[PDB]
A paper describes a structure:
NDV RNA genome is replicated and transcribed by a multifunctional 250 kDa RNA-dependent RNA polymerase (L protein). The L protein consists of the N-terminal RNA-dependent RNA polymerase domain (RdRp), polyribonucleotidyl transferase domain (PRNTase), the connector domain (CD), the methyltransferase domain (MT), and C-terminal domain (CTD). The P protein adopts a unique tetrameric organization and interacts with L protein.
Numbering used by the authors:
A (entry chain E): 236 to 343, 350 to 399
B (entry chain A): 8 to 544, 553 to 583, 588 to 611, 629 to 888, 894 to 1194, 1209 to 1265, 1278 to 1302, 1310 to 1384
C (entry chain D): 236 to 311
D (entry chain C): 236 to 306
E (entry chain B): 234 to 301
The structure:
């Protein structure tokens, strides 16, 4: 029927009128204020570039100036922390995650040790005796860190 | 005076070696101090002008000794005053000729013992083993050549290197102990002993022992415990040199030890106090020498090289570089060539150069460095660990409470996965914990777990030394040493400062009122708490309130929260270790998806673990448990108290060096102090830290996608990264996947421990495919790796400090010898080594005694033979039977002692007079109370042990002033008389049963009072208080002092020197349980009246069977003799007992052996035992209700239905090494009767004979070995008696009970 | 003329925008929650002690002594 | 005249209630996960507040969200 | 004769509403997706990147100096 349908259609499109004109100027202003409130959180988190040794404990300090992710550190303890920062604002950690007042402490082989260990490997592992005598014989002949390593990987493969 | 002959000065070192004690008696005497003590901080600061003006006996002896030593050294040169350890190489080689003669007097008598008794000790060991292995082996019975060298050299203890100094230090030790005892009583006698040794004189006082050398004009001074340290180490290294030279698989170590000792002593003179850094490295070389034998080339040789580099890097700071090279070359030569066992053996060399001298300053610096240090942890890694923490609590509470999550604050369940898993109440897997760590880290809880504050009560009855409060802290030090302004501050000790005593005097002790010291934050208001740190290398002195809350929090975490984390406790710490090392590659190599699993192992070294925790890292982990208990602030008390308090290192002889230190809140973070300790204290708060580390280990296992079976007791973390492989996969792929997974896991574990603040090192830890370390025991390939030579260094010659006790001192040697037999040494060696050492013991106590009689029996050599060889139950000293060498002490002792006496007579060792004098021995006192408290026993006349007497006396004295509301019904006026009356009621019946009455009285409240009394901490400083507040008396204390004499004379009178003309009807050729039953009946006859004391004796397991190894043809001459009741033991042929595990038959774990209050379980135990013993009728139930009424609060209709079935219900030390016992097959089919106690012992006897077939020099097997332990043709087969029921004549005693105590009563009617 | 089933498919089609504009004010209300919550957070993080060079945001051990002078409080 | 405005009406109504109703549940679920990603912001700030020993009497039975709103 | 005026008011109402709703509902989506991208930068600079300092008193000064 014409009238009984037109009444319900007019009522529901008035519901849509009440949707749109309240939905737009409120929600768009609220998300602009929402973005201006999340950007001020983004701009209040002062990074500090922690320069861990981690596990790669090489020399050449600038490498750990290079591989140093930034972090917003949060003081959760009593006292003064200022003798653990740097002109520039960077805090270097120990292997125990301890800050250190001078970051030069992070970056701070022989031949007798390696010969001793490979002799221990030859004498101690299961082996035919003449082959043990052979590898001991061509070990006092060695004279570098290299080619002791050749004997080391030769003994461990039999 | 007899009061001063009870708490004797100790014979072995059980205390730290303090430097400034020794320097006090050095400066106090007149001598010149060493050059390294000239600018010392306590020497220069003290006012010695007043300290030397006391003229006590403490100082006048030192003055006379400073006059006396100074005369025999010239004025022509400078007197050098060498301080320990720079005097090690001298005192190592000390030679007093006097004490050498005085011990060779003993040596001659031991040579007489061997010449009179060596062939019957051959006959015993070649008869018993012949009997148990049958006539298929009677052409293969030859003695071991550990026994034979012991036989040809009787004086092993006297003819080794180190012996001539071992004589000297034992002599100087006993002289100084005698001088202390004689200086206790106020007298004016000769308080000085001078001895003469090769190039010099030895001066002995109560405090110092001073050794001089005249040719080099030097002298060393030793404090009281420093001569204990030298005396322990000389007989330690000499006994090592004995054992490692007479044992065939160990003789190659004998040079390698004698080098490394005499080497490092030479390094003592220039390194000095730092040579123990070289001694602390000696453990890593014994580890790395095992790590040289890996299956693949990876991990082999890494840690040996690391320790070798560290040994060089320490020696080059002090030595010339040529000497560091030569020494490092020597160390690397010593620890190479060794087997697996022979590199486990080099761990003996740990205590074998002694202990460094301690001080408070240099031990407080090493705590300020690592405890007042800044840290920077990762919050986003705290969240990743806290995710697994909350997830593990969720799954533990789920598994404990039938599949229910804890009471989550439900507005904090974030995300579609975690809301789903709560809505199903399912189990979080580790992957969801890793992925959803942001959501799972933020979940809260409500008060769903109800604790119990005093759960354990054994930890409150410990004697932990309590710091006096911080206004009195200078009472920690000797008031002799405080300056005058600091003498104004010390008050008097009203308390004893003991947690044992001040807990029992505690009026108004409520646990829930006392936890409010923490939850209400009053403990941090409290301006009286001072903590004190110990001198060690785990212990601290707290105040009373804070120590109480410490023990409560430990108990609550230990019972409620910690078993959530699987707990990873006697065999469960070695079944879950021996089967964990079945997961190595070499344990399962017959076979080589989801059909096989293997592992590789990481044992880690965390640097300064317990004191790198911070409040910032543990706060949230504590927060997740304060919520789960309904507590505002409980489990983070440690850091918040130590931030606000200042603590110091506690030592009497180490005061603060500055004389203007009055108050703790004004001292600088300096000399002995620690101000605002951010870190933890070791031992304290251990449960929470163990749980955080388990969460981090599981976190890193999930971040590399692997499965981990860890185990951690702090920083003793042992991780087994596993990988499941195929039976048909190549071995290189298996050992490649394992090493890849190990590298990934180790990298992530470094990473997750670094970000919470814990350095586990890359090189210090021990990765291996094969072995791992737990409690200094090395587990390698499904076996435990031998420690005979650690135990040989503990083999000593005095044991006990309560009297001159020879019985306990022979018991100590007996146990240590049994422990060597467990680590793999022959039987015939160890038994006769026990005999020779008990001879040396009983002659060592005659001489050298510090209590000035014995001359009648001490030269009677066959008496001393028959005394240390007769068992201690029958009267003598031999606790170590021949049966204890094969198995463990399960079973009846009396039958075993009679079986030993029957064997010792049957071979001709022990005389035939002595067994008959045992059988005719007059009875003792005899009680119903004593026969109830000690079944299996005899009523022979005996004297009471001073340990038992003084322990019982202290238990009775401490519960006199017992005034706490808890444990109030423990000590009553008639708690003795209830025990006497209850024993008279239970025992005196138609058929006397002692064992079941022991079970009943232990179950009832009388045994409950006994059990709670037996939890107090009877240290010697507790026995001193309980003697100083109620003295022992006159007759008891005279029995204490003359105990060894009375015991020896009692054996001499009763059974050795006796006539006993009315010999009984019992013969000597019967089974020994007949003689044990005759002796129990005849002994208790003036008390029993003639009734058979029955239901006690068991057979002896050795006596019962006559074993037989089969021959080639099969079928035994014992089973061809008309016998089919035996046990089947099978051993497969061709077993390589070493690394080559290619073709071994299946290795398995070898044979080792609800929801109510435990008061109710003890009550039902009483009901079950009473009804099964004395029949089932309502007269018995009338009394059994009355007995169970003492413990619980139930009624009679519940007891008749809740009563259990009538039953038989009336690492540290592994039971052996397991070499062929993982490979032996057991079939108990043909023994149709005993399929209990008998077969549990016959199994272990067979499996001990099988591994006694093969020594430690044999790595292969060559035949299948079968045993038939036949027992039908035995004298000890006797029928079980007919249980004729009856009724308990009379009425049970009243058994009065308090209902307020939760420790003793259960008022809730179940 | 007959426009019957045309009006019927209009009656069909309005139900889609019925359920979606029914869901619209709930989204608007949740934008109002997120605004206040993000405002609370940017209020908080301005007074936390994120470290800069200059180190003026330090707490001492006197704050532990001062704050722990009472029974612990409940903020929820 | 009525049929042309009728078909213009139904064209406009049909395609715009296609695409607005297509657009709504997408932005609905995104404002949903904004809630569960903003709740854990307060939760982690309540975790960060209690690590300092200046706030130890903030008793654990309280809410970490409430400590975020504590000030 | 009434339904003509009815649909004449109706079509401009329906079109005016839904055309002034389309061009807001789609920038609503792109703006809220830009805001979800925006808040993840605080989900990392506050959550992941955050380290916890304790200025441990590695000095020589009394507790009454540290109680200041």
């Amino acid at each position: 029927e014409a009238i009984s349908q037109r009444v319900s259609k007019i009522d529901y499109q008035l519901d849509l009128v009440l949707k749109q004109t309240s939905s737009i100027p409120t929600m768009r202003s609220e998300i602009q204020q929402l973005k201006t409130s999340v950007a001020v959180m983004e701009a209040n988190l002062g990074m500090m570039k922690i320069l861990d040794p981690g596990c790669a404990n090489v020399s050449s300090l600038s490498d750990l100036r290079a591989v140093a992710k930034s972090h917003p550190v949060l003081i959760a303890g009593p006292g003064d922390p200022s003798p653990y920062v740097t002109q520039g604002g960077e805090i270097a950690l120990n292997k125990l995650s301890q800050p250190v007042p001078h970051p030069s402490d992070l970056i701070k082989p022989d031949i007798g040790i390696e010969r001793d260990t490979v002799r221990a490997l030859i004498l101690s592992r299961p082996m035919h005796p003449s082959s043990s005598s052979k590898l001991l014989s061509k070990l006092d002949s060695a004279g570098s860190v290299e080619e002791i390593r050749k004997i080391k990987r030769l003994a461990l493969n039999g | 005076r007899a009061e001063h002959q009870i708490i004797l000065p100790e014979s072995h070192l059980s205390s730290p070696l303090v430097k400034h004690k020794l320097l006090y008696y050095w400066k106090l005497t007149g001598l010149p101090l060493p050059d390294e003590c000239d600018f010392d901080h306590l020497i220069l600061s003290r006012q010695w002008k007043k300290i030397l003006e006391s003229s006590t006996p403490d100082i006048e002896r030192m003055i006379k000794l400073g006059r006396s030593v100074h005369q025999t050294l010239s004025h022509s040169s400078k007197l050098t005053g060498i301080l320990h350890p720079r005097c090690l190489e001298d005192l190592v080689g000390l030679d007093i000729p006097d004490s050498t003669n005085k011990f060779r007097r003993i040596e001659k008598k031991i040579q007489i013992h061997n010449t009179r008794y060596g062939e019957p000790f051959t006959r015993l060991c070649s008869y018993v083993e012949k009997k148990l292995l049958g006539s298929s082996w009677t052409h293969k019975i030859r003695r071991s050549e550990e026994f034979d060298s012991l036989r040809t050299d009787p004086a092993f203890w006297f003819h080794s290197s180190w012996s001539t100094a071992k004589f000297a230090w034992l002599h100087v030790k006993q002289i100084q102990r005698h001088l202390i005892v004689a200086a206790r009583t106020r007298s004016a006698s000769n308080k000085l002993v001078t001895l003469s040794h090769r190039s010099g004189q030895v001066f002995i006082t109560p405090e110092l022992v001073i050794v001089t050398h005249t040719n080099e004009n030097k002298f060393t001074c030793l404090s009281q415990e420093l001569v204990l340290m030298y005396a322990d180490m000389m007989e330690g290294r000499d006994m090592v040199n004995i054992i490692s030279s007479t044992a065939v698989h160990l003789r190659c170590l004998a040079e390698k030890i004698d080098d490394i000792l005499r080497l490092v002593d030479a390094l003592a003179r220039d390194l000095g106090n730092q040579v123990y850094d070289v001694v602390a490295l000696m453990e890593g070389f014994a580890y790395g020498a095992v790590q040289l034998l890996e299956p693949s080339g990876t991990f082999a040789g890494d840690f040996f090289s690391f320790n070798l580099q560290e040994l060089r890097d320490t020696l080059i700071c002090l030595l010339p570089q040529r000497i560091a090279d030569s020494v490092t070359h020597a160390i690397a030569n010593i620890f190479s060539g060794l087997e697996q066992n022979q590199a486990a053996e080099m761990l003996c060399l740990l205590r074998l150069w002694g202990h460094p001298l301690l001080e408070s300053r240099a031990a407080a610096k090493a705590v300020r460095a690592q405890m007042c240090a800044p840290k920077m942890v990762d919050f986003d890694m705290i969240l990743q660990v806290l995710s697994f923490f909350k997830g593990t609590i969720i799954n533990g509470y789920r598994k404990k409470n039938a599949g229910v999550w804890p009471r989550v604050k439900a507005h904090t369940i974030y995300g579609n996965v975690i809301a789903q898993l709560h809505a199903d109440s399912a189990e979080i897997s580790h992957d969801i914990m890793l992925r959803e760590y942001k959501n799972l880290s933020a979940i809260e809880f409500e008060a769903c777990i109800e604790y119990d504050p005093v759960t354990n009560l054994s930890m409150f009855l410990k004697d932990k030394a309590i710091a006096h409060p911080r206004n009195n802290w200078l009472a920690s030090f000797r008031r002799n040493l405080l300056s005058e302004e600091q003498k104004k501050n010390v008050q008097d000790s009203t308390s004893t400062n003991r947690l044992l005593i001040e807990f029992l005097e505690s009026n108004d002790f409520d646990p829930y009122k006392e936890m409010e010291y923490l939850t209400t934050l009053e403990y941090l208001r409290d301006d009286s708490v001072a903590v004190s740190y110990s001198l060690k290398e785990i212990f601290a002195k707290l105040t009373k309130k804070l120590r109480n809350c410490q023990v409560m929090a430990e108990g609550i975490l230990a019972d409620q929260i910690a078993p959530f984390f699987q707990g990873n406790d006697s065999i469960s710490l070695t079944k879950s270790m021996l089967a964990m090392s079945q997961l190595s590659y070499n344990s399962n190599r017959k076979r080589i998806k989801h059909r096989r699993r293997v592992a590789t192992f990481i044992t880690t070294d965390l640097q300064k673990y317990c004191l790198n925790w911070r409040y910032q890292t543990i706060k949230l982990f504590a927060h997740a448990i304060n919520q789960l208990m309904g507590l505002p602030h409980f489990f983070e008390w440690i850091h918040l108290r130590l931030m606000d308090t200042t603590m110091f290192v506690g030592d009497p002889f180490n005061p603060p060096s500055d004389p203007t230190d009055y108050d703790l809140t004004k001292v600088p973070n300096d000399d002995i102090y620690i101000v605002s300790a951010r870190g933890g204290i070791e031992g304290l708060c251990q449960k929470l830290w163990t749980m955080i580390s388990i969460a981090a280990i599981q976190l890193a296992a999930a971040r590399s996608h692997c499965r981990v079976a860890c185990m951690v007791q702090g920083d003793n973390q042992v991780i087994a990264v596993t990988r499941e492989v195929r039976p048909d996969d190549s071995p290189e792929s298996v050992l490649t996947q394992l090493h890849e997974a190990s590298d990934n896991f180790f990298r992530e574990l470094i990473h997750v421990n670094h970000l919470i603040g814990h350095n586990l090192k890359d090189r210090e830890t021990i990765r291996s495919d094969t072995f791992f370390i737990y409690s200094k025991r090395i587990f390698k390939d499904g076996a435990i790796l031998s420690q005979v030579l650690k135990n040989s260094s503990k083999l000593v010659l005095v044991s006990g400090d309560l009297s001159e006790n020879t019985v306990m001192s022979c018991a100590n040697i007996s146990s240590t010898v049994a422990r060597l037999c467990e680590n793999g040494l022959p039987k015939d060696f160890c038994y006769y080594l026990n005999y020779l050492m008990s001879c040396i013991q009983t002659y060592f106590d005659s001489e050298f005694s510090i209590t000035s009689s014995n001359q009648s029996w001490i030269n009677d050599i066959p008496f001393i033979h028959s005394y240390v060889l007769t068992p201690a139950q029958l009267g003598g000293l031999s606790n170590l039977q021949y049966s204890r060498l094969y198995t463990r002490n399960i079973g009846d002792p009396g039958t075993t002692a009679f079986a030993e006496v029957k064997r010792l007579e049957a071979v001709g060792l022990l005389g035939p007079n002595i067994m008959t004098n045992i059988l005719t021995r007059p009875p003792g006192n005899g009680d119903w109370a004593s026969l109830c408290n000690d079944p299996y026993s005899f009523n022979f006349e005996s004297v009471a042990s001073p340990s038992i007497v003084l322990k019982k006396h202290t238990q009775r004295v401490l519960f006199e002033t017992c005034s706490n509301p808890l444990l109030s019904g423990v000590h009553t006026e008639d708690n003795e008389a209830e025990e006497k009356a209850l024993a008279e009621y239970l025992l005196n019946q138609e058929v006397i049963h002692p064992r079941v009455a022991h079970a009943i009285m232990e179950a009832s409240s009388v045994g409950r009072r006994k059990q709670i009394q037996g939890l107090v901490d009877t240290t010697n400083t507790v026995i001193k208080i309980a003697l100083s507040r109620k003295p022992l008396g006159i007759k008891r204390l005279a029995r204490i002092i003359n105990y060894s004499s009375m015991h020896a004379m009692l054996f001499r009178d009763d059974v050795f020197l006796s006539n006993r003309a009315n010999h009984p009807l019992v013969s000597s050729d019967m089974c020994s349980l007949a003689l044990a039953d005759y002796a129990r009946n005849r002994s208790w006859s003036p008390l029993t009246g003639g009734r058979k004391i029955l239901g006690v004796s068991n057979p002896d397991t050795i006596e019962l069977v006559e074993g037989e190894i089969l021959s080639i043809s099969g079928g035994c001459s014992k089973c061809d003799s008309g016998d089919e009741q035996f046990t089947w033991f099978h051993l497969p042929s061709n077993i390589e007992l070493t690394d080559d595990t290619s073709k071994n038959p299946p290795m398995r774990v070898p044979y080792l052996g609800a929801h109510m209050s435990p008061h109710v379980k003890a009550a039902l135990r009483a009901s079950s035992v009473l009804i099964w013993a004395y029949g089932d009728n309502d007269i018995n139930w009338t009394a059994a209700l009355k007995l169970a009424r003492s413990r619980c609060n139930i009624s009679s209709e519940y007891l008749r239905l809740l009563s259990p079935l009538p039953t038989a219900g009336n690492t540290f030390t592994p039971a052996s090494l397991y070499r062929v016992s993982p490979y032996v097959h057991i079939s108990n089919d043909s023994q149709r009767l005993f399929t209990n106690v008998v077969y549990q012992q016959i199994m272990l006897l067979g499996l001990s004979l099988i591994e006694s077939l093969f020594p430690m020099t044999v790595t292969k097997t060559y035949d299948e070995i079968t045993l038939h332990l036949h027992s039908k043709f035995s004298c000890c087969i006797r029928e079980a008696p007919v249980a004729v029921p009856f009724e308990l004549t009379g009425v049970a005693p009243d058994l009065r009970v308090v209902a307020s105590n939760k420790f003793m009563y259960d008022p809730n009617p179940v």
